[PDB]
Design a protein that fits this description.
This is part of a larger assembly, with one copy of chain A, two copies of chain B and two copies of chain C. By secondary structure, chain A is of the alpha+beta class. The two termini of chain A are 27 Å apart. Chain B is of the alpha+beta class. The chains are: A alpha+beta, B alpha+beta, C mainly alpha. At the A-E interface, helix 8 of A face loops of E. The complex binds factor 430 (F43), Coenzyme B, 1-thioethanesulfonic acid (2 copies), chloride ion, magnesium ion (14 copies), sodium ion (9 copies) and 1 more.
Chain lengths: 247, 442, 548, 548, 110
């Protein structure tokens, strides 16, 4: 698959996030328990709640589509559908809202992705969510200064940075440590205090953020200068316009 | 012979049924099984005799939490259901040999009613079904128990609710798949105002049958609305065939190839490859390491793309066994395929747009609800001309119990009555059979 | 001794009420009236300020060739010129409508099920109280989640709030009492038991949106505004994502699945959304009126408080403005709530019934209708014949038709305990009155009256309905003055005689048992009087945001 | 020289507008804000007086971890906190809607034909003047025929009146000038000539009912109230029987045959009668705004005054209250009328077009759409990238999307002289923006946006319509913020560039050219500023009939 | 020709289109009938009246046999005539929306 037109680093990074064969760079190590804590849906060691019985306990209708489509493990188990939500700074965060939703539906099964300007969300069965969330938190989807895990009070994508280079957060979920140069997650994604903070590692330096970003800007690579990407968007406009009138 | 196109028609197990069927043999204007389904939906009513009896015994009539103390009437309606139903049928029918059907269900707790076609042949619209049914049952109950003049108005309230003070039959103990004509968003919309949950109920959660029923209703509405007249007729017919009728087994085969491990994006890749293999699209221009696709047949590209969209829904929402993400699939299937190809997405962006608003109004405070409460007449989901709602029906068919406002919650009376009708429950079978029967008349 | 209307007639006229002759033409026209003099002076001032002629007594015909009468508000000692009872000039009447229009009832039952079953979280009296603190901040128009939100000024929206009620006393006792409509405090014991049993363990919100918003907007705003702020408060109080798939379930519950509108929407010729007067059924209007919980040993008082509520809303505001406008229909309505006239006639009928049958003990049949409605009609008409001042007071035949038939129909319902035979009695009254005086009402008054007898007991699609379920959109009733509020009274009548806690919807009855309303629904006529005296303080004013 | 928004950025923040970094968290939360402080204190007072908690800053999350910004009202030197631009808190905004809601246009052409042909009476300028004197007494709610009428207090209804206009100058001069909207006074010469030619010998009434009535009732009251008092005044002034068969012709003419509503009725899901915001087509909104007749040498100013008009009405009042409610949508709308932002981008675009093509001189085709909409979109988005303070100001993507696309769409229409290609440019803008920033608006922002390109030039039943005829009930447009007021601007744009006197209805244009209106439609943004400062005096208050 | 579309006294300056519809009524009506009919020689009728100033249209019964109600009559007729006029004069994509407004009015805003 070709994913996205364009000849910039931005366009290539958009392609790489979509391509499931592209191995995302792992930037940090996070324990299984700490993923659960950040998500804030259950305590470590708590059984997964259920919304319906396991599929093997139910009588499903005779249905070739059901037969052909393998359920994800959390669907087999009857897990709740829960979420993880991220905000990405316009100051060169690696991932950005539509890039995430496009990538998520190329890489992940059984996914409900939503894109907004200040927030981007995935909802799926809880145990599968935990697996996906490890990848979203440990890899180059995430930078701890320019991205935030936020289930509410999302303001900040469009704000100026603080003196440490950190994005604004009304609830200050992620704290930069001047003594280490590392960011700690001190609250879960809904803003409740964690017992023990989670190390998120060092923010990416300016050169690396530029290398990895998926936003176009005049002080990076401008969209207007990715003429092949622009051409394709204008083509889609024209073809949609003509199609609505006649074929 | 308006159009040259032929399709191969399959069943819901992926077996070829009839090869080389002229496209117009599936048109709502030509196919006798689509006619039968639409006329059946116009004329069929569910009657909740248990509900009428309980409303009367408690004087709980006229809407939520309503009650009139002192008006209670204790009538053995369910126990006398056979006599009441027979008396009602005598009033409903035009002649003894006509197509009136009155069938008791649930030991007399429910009745299936199909009002005779002859009443609709001299009617402007479809409201004769609930209104003839309601007055026949009101009169049959009154006559069964010799209810007095002084009390009979309670029987009326128990059957039809607060109408005519309310515009709707508020609190009624009868139901139809259609809703009242006043609630149409536009002239020609009546076949679109059928809740997704009602389609999934009638089809017993069989995913391909739900998709078929929804597509038949939506595309038939497109004819009534005039959208499928002249320039756009073939586009609508091809969408009915490929998206809703599994033409050429394209939906089924995409699902088969992507069901074990696939994603929306893997379905897209396979659909683009298939469109290239079949000559529907071809490379038009080469950019820098990027192929721009073109087509000489936009309607056929749209139909292939719509089959892919249906298969992507089945793969994505099927894998979760959870319907909510259909709004996301409908959005990003289309967004991704345009940047994959350089060609417009399904319905020239109108599925994508419907999906944006549907996603918002299924994940926000402002309105909407879960997928099952939508329909082609809903302000959120009316915009695509038949290409979005059938996917919602597939997704709700695949839901294993994640929804609060499920078909069990919203559509139980519809389920019990309308699933009894073979052509409502298994419409794909009947439409395919009728297409085959008329193939040489096209 | 005296009929109940005698004091009012003696206040209006120099003559004793029995006298047949008087003097006209030498009263000074408009100059006899303090209020018309105020208007003449104000019209001159207005016209000069704006440069366009306005009120001018010399236009058209010269008012005040006869006495321009004071009216007693019935059950009060307040006497006012009729212009003080025009809804435009009476802030109490405008607030009564605003308090209905801005109310919706919204269950928490489905919502709590979403929290427990879909989110997997607990609902307890503590979480409910937390939610109620949150929604009482958010409902008037203030923020709970986002940064950089702008908000309504609290003092402009001081009248908006959310309370709850439930039939479970133990649960009600655990929620902060600031937020609870206490059924055991507000209703007498037997009524409280009935209402609690109807609600059961259900928990229901009564939401009141700001009057200033209702006035800027319309009634169909109310359930939307309610749902938005319920939605935000559920997010905040129960730790959802702020916008996940479950959020849509709360929306659909609050807007559709567990909402009770005051009024249903209207057909296109009279197009209006929910929570407009024409959508409010007669049984709901009776239940909105709170006379039933304070005056329950006097069924006539309860029924006539309902008639006052409905004659003002339905004739003055609804038919006289929403459906027409201009000078409008003040005195078509005041006939039903002034001078103690309807009171005299209805007390007569109640006494007749009590003595002959006993309340609620007559056969529910046409024999009872013919007896009671005929007797009461003849009594009321005889009063107009014996007291020429009474006839000159209620000078329009429509007014008289409404008053006499209201007494006749309420009295019939007191006898049978059934509103439908009360309605039959209303129509019989009309027919007898028409033949007695060779006149009835205005040109179009008896459209519904002549369809009436046949439609009382019909069962046909757009004809048959229990009276409680009928309202201003019942086809025959959709156009004409001098009926709707009186029908609300007849709906109330058998229930008042029976001692029932409500007429048609127990949730609506409990929702208006609330001392935080602006208008006092326990004493509708008293409030009308207060507004007539320019002593009522409404909500919704803009003084704080305008110059001094 | 400097961008037009620079001064506002420098007023908001200590940093230079290009600076990427700031300081958060140490501002005192809500205590940084005079307005929030007022609200905290008011909430204490409200809760204490009523016994129910209300506004409380500590509910939910803590506002003001960033700067709570002042906003400049564009074209003014007035800076206010955003709360002062909430419609609840702004009496100018409320009165703007009341002045629209309470207006209907009613011909006299059929009426005068009834008088001449059916009654056999003459109509002259003198009989028209006598009728106008009569209807200016009657319209606010005063009587002309019957004895013992009760009436509205003239001072409460001082804002209600009837004027006329005609294209025939010599006839206009013969009607008393107190009642005439003088087209030659109010419009520049070329616009006046166009308007007079459209009206011709027709004679039209502009009726304004009382704001107090509109607020008590609804929009669908207006044409009914109008008709009742027209009817009474035709009876009085032309000597009819007071209720004969011909009377019904006047009713049908005033209610149906020659009425022009501001808004048409809405379908059931969003049920509303006439004269509600959703029924007002975009071309009518442009014509209501009176910037066209005062700022006609500046097409940008005219178009952006229409955008302000529409963003406030359609987003704040209609979508943010009638269709939702709560805190609502102030800043979704203020983005289009504050900080001179939209003005900078739109002047850029107008200058681009004037230099490349000349206004109205570009080919009306897709080549021109691609050129102009792309250039203007890239300019707007670059401003957010070059000025971090600008991006923090218009912090929501939807705000940015609406502002950039409004500039792109207006500019395209300035080039082509056709609103339809303007609309195509709006959608193209959205597509480019979304790819540039990998984001656009809120979850549901681009429903219409993705349907948009295909539906611009469609001819199908519920898809095809010239932009001027579209409105808030066009299917794709019925739900979402950040589009409807901007579309009214794009509808105005080609007509402002062309110098046309109106966009879609010349009668509506003339009807709002009236100095006796309360709100000043010639300077909408100035009026919003006056209301934000608490300096606007609305109609409809009840101070006269309430305690002092 | 006047750009007077969309309701009483409405007009869009600059949108006028000078099309000889009545002079070309036979061609336009034939083209509309081809779109309105379901099959050749069905019960579709399209008849010009008043020298081409008016047309009687009867939409085929088969359309109503698969419809809920009766709105197919105006809707099918309207779109056929819109399309037939556009095709007769080769009205551009940019202008064709005016033909739609001239036939069906302010729908769907009204
Ligand atoms: C709960 C929701 C989901 C929903 O259905 N509506 C919300 C909330 C709602 C509430 C917020 C009031 C409160 O805080 O109590 C109100 C004011 C509507 C109402 N009920 O009165 C609103 N949104 Ni929202 N909402 C807005 C906006 C937005 C932007 C904010 C992005 C950012 O970076 O700050 C995002 C969408 C996006 O990402 O594009 C957004 C989301 C959301 N919007 C998320 C909450 C986001 C969060 O957790 O912080 N709004 C805007 O983009 C600007 C205008 C602003 C609205 C108020 C106004 O116009 O003044 C407000 C409009
Ligand atoms: C969708 C629909 O709601 P329902 O699905 O019918 O509950 C509709 N609301 C809206 O369109 C809300 C629009 C204003 C708030 C969102 C602005 S982006 C309405 O209430 O009639
Ligand atoms: O005289 S009419 O009966 O037409 C009207 C009475 S207000
Ligand atoms: O977050 S959502 O896009 O659903 C609402 C924005 S106000
Ligand atoms: Cl084709
Ligand atoms: Mg590990
Ligand atoms: Mg740990
Ligand atoms: Mg099978
Ligand atoms: Mg039995
Ligand atoms: Mg048989
Ligand atoms: Mg009998
Ligand atoms: Mg493959
Ligand atoms: Mg004496
Ligand atoms: Mg004497
Ligand atoms: Mg619990
Ligand atoms: Mg208290
Ligand atoms: Mg307390
Ligand atoms: Mg002269
Ligand atoms: Mg230049
Ligand atoms: Na006296
Ligand atoms: Na005597
Ligand atoms: Na006079
Ligand atoms: Na009407
Ligand atoms: Na003031
Ligand atoms: Na500064
Ligand atoms: Na707070
Ligand atoms: Na609705
Ligand atoms: Na024929
Ligand atoms: Zn109002």
């Amino acid at each position: 698959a070709q994913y996205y037109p364009g000849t910039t680093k931005v366009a290539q990074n958009r392609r790489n996030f979509c391509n499931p064969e592209y191995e995302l760079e792992k930037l940090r190590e996070i324990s299984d328990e700490d993923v659960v804590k950040i998500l804030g849906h259950r305590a470590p060691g708590e059984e997964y709640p259920s919304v319906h019985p396991p599929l093997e306990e139910m009588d499903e209708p005779e249905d070739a589509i059901r037969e052909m489509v393998e359920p994800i493990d959390g669907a087999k188990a009857g897990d709740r559908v829960r979420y993880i939500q991220f905000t990405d700074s316009m100051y060169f965060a690696p991932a950005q809202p539509y890039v995430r939703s496009r990538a998520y539906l190329c890489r992940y099964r059984g996914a409900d992705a939503g894109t907004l300007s200040g927030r981007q969300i995935i909802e799926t069965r809880e145990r599968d969510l935990e697996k996906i969330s490890k990848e979203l938190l440990e890899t180059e989807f995430f930078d701890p200064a320019r991205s935030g895990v936020r289930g509410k009070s999302v303001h900040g994508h469009s704000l100026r940075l603080d003196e440490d280079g950190m994005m604004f957060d009304m609830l200050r979920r992620q704290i930069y440590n001047k003594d280490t140069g590392r960011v700690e997650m001190v609250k879960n994604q809904i803003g409740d205090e964690l017992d023990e903070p989670v190390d998120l590692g060092e923010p990416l330096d300016e050169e690396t953020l530029m290398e990895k970003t998926t936003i176009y800007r005049v002080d990076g690579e401008a969209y207007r200068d990715d003429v092949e990407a622009v051409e394709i968007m204008q083509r889609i406009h024209v073809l949609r316009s003509q199609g609505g009138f006649n074929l | 012979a308006k159009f040259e196109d032929k399709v191969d028609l399959y069943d819901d197990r992926g077996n070829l049924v009839e090869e080389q069927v002229p496209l117009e043999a599936l048109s709502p204007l030509r196919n006798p099984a689509i006619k039968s389904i639409v006329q059946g939906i116009k004329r069929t009513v569910a009657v909740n005799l248990e509900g009428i009896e309980n409303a009367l015994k408690t004087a709980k009539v006229g809407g939520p939490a309503c009650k009139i103390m002192g008006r209670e009437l204790d009538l053995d309606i369910v126990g006398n259901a056979e006599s009441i139903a027979a008396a009602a049928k005598e009033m409903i029918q035009v002649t003894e040999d006509d197509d009136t059907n009155v069938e008791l269900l649930g030991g007399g707790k429910r009745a299936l009613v199909q009002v005779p076609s002859a009443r609709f042949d001299v009617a402007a619209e479809y409201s004769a079904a609930p209104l003839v049914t309601a007055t026949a049952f009101v009169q049959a109950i009154i006559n069964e128990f010799d209810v007095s003049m002084y009390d009979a108005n309670m029987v009326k309230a128990a059957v039809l609710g607060r109408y005519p003070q309310s515009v709707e039959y508020m609190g009624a103990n009868i139901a139809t798949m259609l809703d009242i004509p006043q609630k149409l968003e536009g002239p020609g919309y009546a076949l679109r105002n059928i809740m997704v949950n009602h389609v999934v109920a009638a089809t017993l959660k069989n995913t391909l049958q739900a998709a078929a029923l929804s597509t038949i209703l939506e595309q038939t509405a497109m004819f009534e609305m005039g959208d499928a007249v002249g320039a756009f007729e073939r586009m609508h017919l091809l969408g009915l065939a490929y998206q809703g009728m599994n033409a050429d087994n394209l939906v089924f085969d995409l699902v088969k190839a992507n069901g074990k491990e696939g994603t929306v994006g893997s379905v897209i890749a396979d659909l683009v490859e298939r469109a290239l293999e079949d000559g529907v699209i071809k490379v038009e221009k080469e950019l820098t390491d990027y192929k721009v696709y073109g087509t000489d047949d936009l309607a056929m590209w749209n139909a292939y793309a719509a089959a892919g969209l249906m298969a992507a829904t089945m793969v994505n929402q099927g894998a979760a066994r959870a319907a909510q993400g259909v709004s996301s699939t409908l959005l990003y299937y289309n967004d991704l395929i345009e940047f994959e190809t350089g060609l417009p997405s399904v319905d020239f962006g109108k599925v994508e747009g419907t999906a944006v608003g549907f996603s918002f109004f299924s994940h926000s405070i402002y309105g909407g609800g879960g997928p099952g409460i939508f329909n082609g007449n809903h302000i959120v989901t009316r915009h695509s001309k038949g290409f979005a709602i059938p996917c919602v029906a597939a997704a709700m068919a695949l839901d294993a119990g994640t929804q609060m406002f499920s078909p069990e919650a919203t559509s139980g009376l519809i389920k019990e009555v309308f699933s009894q009708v073979d052509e409502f429950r298994e419409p794909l079978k009947y439409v395919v059979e009728a297409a085959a029967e008329i193939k040489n008349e096209i | 001794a005296d009929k109940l209307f005698i004091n009012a007639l003696k206040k209006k006229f120099e003559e004793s009420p029995e006298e047949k002759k008087t003097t006209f033409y030498t009263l000074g026209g408009w100059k006899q009236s303090e209020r018309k003099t105020e208007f003449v002076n104000a019209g001159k001032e207005v016209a000069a300020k704006r440069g366009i002629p306005q009120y001018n007594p010399d236009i058209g015909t010269p008012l005040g060739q006869r006495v321009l009468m004071p009216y007693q508000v019935s059950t009060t000692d307040t006497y006012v010129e009729g212009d003080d009872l025009h809804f435009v000039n009476n802030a109490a009447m405008q607030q009564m409508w605003d308090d209905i229009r801005r109310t919706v009832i919204v269950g928490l039952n489905h919502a709590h099920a979403v929290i427990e079953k879909r989110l997997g979280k607990e609902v307890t009296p503590e979480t409910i109280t937390h939610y109620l603190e949150t929604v009482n901040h958010a409902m008037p128009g203030a923020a709970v989640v986002q940064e950089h939100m702008v908000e309504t000024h609290p003092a402009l929206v001081a009248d908006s709030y959310v309370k709850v009620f439930t039939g479970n006393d133990e649960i009600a006792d655990e929620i902060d009492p600031a937020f609870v409509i206490d059924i055991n405090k507000q209703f007498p014991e037997d009524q409280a038991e009935t209402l609690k049993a109807e609600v059961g363990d259900g928990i229901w919100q009564v939401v009141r949106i700001p009057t200033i918003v209702s006035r800027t907007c319309d009634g169909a705003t109310t359930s939307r505004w309610s749902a938005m702020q319920i939605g935000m408060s559920m997010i905040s109080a129960y730790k959802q994502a702020a916008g996940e798939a479950a959020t849509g379930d709360f929306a659909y519950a609050a807007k559709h699945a567990e909402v009770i509108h005051m009024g249903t929407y209207l057909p296109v010729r009279r197009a209006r959304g929910e929570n407009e007067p024409g959508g409010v059924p007669f049984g709901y209007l009776a239940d909105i009126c709170q006379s039933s919980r304070v005056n329950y040993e006097d069924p006539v008082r309860v029924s006539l408080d309902v008639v006052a509520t409905g004659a003002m809303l339905y004739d003055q505001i609804w038919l006289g403005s929403y459906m027409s406008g201009g000078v409008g229909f003040t005195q078509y309505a005041t006939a039903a709530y002034t001078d103690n006239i309807l009171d005299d006639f209805t007390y007569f009928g109640k006494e007749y019934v009590e003595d002959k049958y006993g309340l609620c003990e007559a056969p529910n049949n046409m024999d009872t209708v013919l007896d009671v409605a005929t007797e009461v009609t003849f009594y009321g008409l005889e009063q107009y014949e014996e007291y020429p001042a009474l006839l000159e007071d209620q000078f329009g035949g429509s007014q008289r038709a409404a008053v006499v038939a209201a007494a006749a129909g309420c009295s019939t319902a007191f006898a049978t305990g059934n509103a439908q035979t009360g309605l039959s009695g209303w129509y019989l009254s009309m027919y007898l009155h028409k033949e007695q005086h060779s006149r009835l009402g205005f040109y179009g008054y008896d459209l519904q009256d002549q369809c009436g007898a046949s439609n009382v007991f019909s069962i046909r699609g757009d004809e048959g309905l229990p009276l409680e379920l009928r309202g201003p959109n019942y086809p025959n009733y959709a156009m004409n003055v001098g009926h709707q509020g009186e029908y609300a009274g007849i709906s109330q009548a058998p229930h008042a005689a029976r001692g029932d806690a409500f007429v048609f919807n127990p949730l609506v009855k409990i929702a208006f048992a609330d001392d935080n309303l602006v208008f006092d629904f326990t004493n509708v006529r008293g409030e009308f009087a207060k507004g007539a005296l320019r002593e009522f303080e409404p909500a919704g004013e803009r003084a704080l945001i305008t110059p001094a």
